[PDB]
Design a protein around this motif. Structure first.
Motif, PDB file in Angstrom:
ATOM      1  N   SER A 165       2.236  -0.816  -7.664  1.00 35.44           N
ATOM      2  CA  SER A 165       3.003  -1.056  -6.573  1.00 35.44           C
ATOM      3  C   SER A 165       4.062  -1.601  -6.305  1.00 35.44           C
ATOM      4  O   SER A 165       4.889  -1.178  -5.419  1.00 35.44           O
ATOM      5  CB  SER A 165       1.591  -1.546  -5.758  1.00 35.44           C
TER       6      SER A 165
ATOM      7  N   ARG B 215       6.929   3.128 -12.371  1.00 39.51           N
ATOM      8  CA  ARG B 215       6.445   3.984 -11.480  1.00 39.51           C
ATOM      9  C   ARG B 215       5.498   5.134 -12.070  1.00 39.51           C
ATOM     10  O   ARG B 215       4.411   5.413 -11.406  1.00 39.51           O
ATOM     11  CB  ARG B 215       8.070   4.836 -11.186  1.00 39.51           C
TER      12      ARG B 215
ATOM     13  N   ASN C 179       0.742  -1.316  -0.011  1.00 37.44           N
ATOM     14  CA  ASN C 179      -0.053  -0.194   0.122  1.00 37.44           C
ATOM     15  C   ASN C 179       0.932   1.468  -0.105  1.00 37.44           C
ATOM     16  O   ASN C 179       0.287   2.471  -0.049  1.00 37.44           O
ATOM     17  CB  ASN C 179      -1.133  -0.108   1.202  1.00 37.44           C
ATOM     18  N   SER C 180       2.060   1.155   0.030  1.00 35.03           N
ATOM     19  CA  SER C 180       2.950   2.389  -0.005  1.00 35.03           C
ATOM     20  C   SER C 180       2.908   3.258  -1.307  1.00 35.03           C
ATOM     21  O   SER C 180       2.367   2.919  -2.370  1.00 35.03           O
ATOM     22  CB  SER C 180       4.490   2.033   0.214  1.00 35.03           C
ATOM     23  N   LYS C 181       3.455   4.260  -1.146  1.00 34.45           N
ATOM     24  CA  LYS C 181       3.470   5.369  -2.122  1.00 34.45           C
ATOM     25  C   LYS C 181       4.715   5.145  -3.197  1.00 34.45           C
ATOM     26  O   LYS C 181       4.520   5.784  -4.176  1.00 34.45           O
ATOM     27  CB  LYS C 181       3.391   6.864  -1.781  1.00 34.45           C
ATOM     28  N   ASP C 182       5.684   4.304  -2.904  1.00 37.38           N
ATOM     29  CA  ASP C 182       6.731   3.999  -3.735  1.00 37.38           C
ATOM     30  C   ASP C 182       6.410   2.673  -4.418  1.00 37.38           C
ATOM     31  O   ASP C 182       6.104   1.956  -3.936  1.00 37.38           O
ATOM     32  CB  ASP C 182       8.054   3.845  -2.898  1.00 37.38           C
TER      33      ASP C 182
ATOM     34  N   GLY D 186       2.001   3.788 -11.882  1.00 33.81           N
ATOM     35  CA  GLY D 186       1.506   3.534 -10.552  1.00 33.81           C
ATOM     36  C   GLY D 186       1.544   2.347 -10.106  1.00 33.81           C
ATOM     37  O   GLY D 186       0.768   1.980  -9.120  1.00 33.81           O
TER      38      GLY D 186
ATOM     39  N   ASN E 288      -6.826   2.945 -10.422  1.00 35.04           N
ATOM     40  CA  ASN E 288      -6.323   2.881  -9.384  1.00 35.04           C
ATOM     41  C   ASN E 288      -7.466   2.405  -8.327  1.00 35.04           C
ATOM     42  O   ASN E 288      -7.416   3.015  -7.054  1.00 35.04           O
ATOM     43  CB  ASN E 288      -5.656   4.177  -8.787  1.00 35.04           C
TER      44      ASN E 288
END
Length: 258
Positions: free
Chosen positions: A213, A208, A13-16, A211, A188
């Motif tokens: 994950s 990246r 679930n991270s943003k990176d 998007g 998303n």
């Protein structure tokens, strides 16, 4: 300390863009951890040992040999609902952080699991969990089997709605066009995991931008190990000497450390 299940869920679930690396036994799991990877893709256990009961044994060893989460590449043990629920419990008890279940039933027009049945199975797994952070990743084989984008999206949505923590959208093309088409249609609705083995020349920054994950490097330690063993064995068989291999392998001290 953070539970391994929680560690994996946070990564999904991270943003990176996150990365996990294949390990196929206790030793490779240790090496992947020592290298800095934040997670392990448990796969190739059967080939390594040359083989569900025996598979789970190796995981306990891999799990006991590492501190980072292991996401299991599961392809046995969830044949029916009772087994699927039992499988989750067994993995949870052994420290495994999550399981990746696939809807594949095998290349065009090949069959996939009944959508309602598989979605129901994902739901049963989620209901079986005792650790709220154990992860269930649902792998969609629609593109591989020649069903188009509509089918891939329909399945990803059904599985996510059933509770999957992430969708592993697969493709065997040399380019990421199927993944791009899916990410655009997906809007998303949840974390997406990919296995770029066949479209490996794609620049990683492209994932990246899409998007994505998490990326799974799926089988390279096993493939490297086999290459090394094959080459080393042949070299010694032909030379009847160790002179041409001694400088290309680790010292016995490194083994002693391990």
């Amino acid at each position: 300390k953070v539970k391994k299940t929680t560690q994996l869920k946070q990564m999904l679930n991270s943003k990176d863009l996150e990365f996990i690396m294949e390990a196929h036994n206790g030793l490779s799991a240790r090496i992947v951890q020592e290298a800095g990877f934040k997670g392990i893709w448990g796969s190739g256990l059967s080939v390594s040992a040359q083989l569900w009961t025996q598979v789970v044994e190796v995981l306990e060893f891999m799990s006991d040999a590492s501190d980072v989460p292991i996401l299991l590449d599961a392809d046995t043990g969830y044949g029916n609902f009772n087994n699927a629920r039992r499988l989750v419990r067994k993995l949870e008890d052994r420290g495994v952080a999550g399981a990746c279940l696939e809807d594949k039933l095998f290349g065009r027009a090949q069959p996939l699991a009944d959508i309602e049945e598989f979605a129901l199975k994902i739901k049963a797994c989620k209901d079986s969990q005792t650790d709220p952070d154990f992860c269930i990743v649902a792998r969609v084989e629609a593109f591989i089997a020649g069903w188009g984008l509509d089918e891939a999206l329909k399945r990803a949505e059904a599985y996510r709605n059933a509770g999957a923590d992430a969708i592993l959208m697969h493709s065997k093309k040399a380019d990421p066009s199927d993944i791009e088409a899916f990410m655009k249609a997906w809007n998303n609705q949840g974390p997406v995991v990919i296995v770029p083995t066949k479209y490996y020349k794609t620049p990683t920054d492209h994932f990246r931008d899409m998007g994505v994950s998490m990326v799974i490097w799926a089988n390279h330690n096993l493939r490297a190990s086999v290459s090394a063993i094959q080459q080393t064995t042949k070299q010694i068989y032909d030379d009847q000497s160790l002179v041409n291999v001694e400088d290309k392998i680790v010292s016995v001290k490194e083994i002693f450390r391990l």
